[PDB]
Amino acid sequence: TSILTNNSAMAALSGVRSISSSMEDTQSRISSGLRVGSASDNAAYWSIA
Amino acid sequence: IESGVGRLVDADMNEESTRLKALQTQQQLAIQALSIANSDSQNVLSLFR
């Protein structure tokens, strides 16, 4: 056991970051509709729209 | 001439009613999403007991 590093905490941190990014994306998606909401989404469908 | 003025200026009420209902629903969803976003912030307190 090392008090200087925590592999489990780091993995949990990466998981939390991924969940936060996904939650932000879904929250914007439900706020404004627009499944293709910006150019960061599928560019071809955005241009067609 | 006034019939032409009406054709150029009058608006169908049914489409406006549909838009009003859609915008009311969108406002309700946006308010709910904003409330969820505000409630998201205070979850971090669990780390600091």
CA of A19 vs chain B CAs: smallest distance (Å): 12
**Long-range Cβ contacts of A22-25 (<8 Å, 24+ apart):** A23/B40
**What are the C-alpha distances in Å from B31 to residues A26, B37, B38?**
15, 10, 11
CA distance A43 to A32: 18
Question: How many other CB atoms are there within 10 angstroms of residue A44's CB atom?
Answer: 9
Helix extents (H) in A1-49: 7-32, 43-48
Contacts of A37 in chain B (CB under 8 A): none
| Eight-state DSSP code of residue A40 | T
Is the Cβ pair B37, A33 closer than 8 Å?
Answer: no
**What are the C-alpha distances in Å from A3 to residues A10, A11, A12?**
13, 16, 17
| Experimental approach | cryo-EM
Q: Are A27 and B36 in contact (CB under 8 A)?
A: yes
Q: How many CB pairs under 8 A join A and B?
A: 12
Q: What are residue A27's phi and psi, to 5 degrees?
A: -65, -45
Q: What are residue A44's phi and psi, to 5 degrees?
A: -65, -45
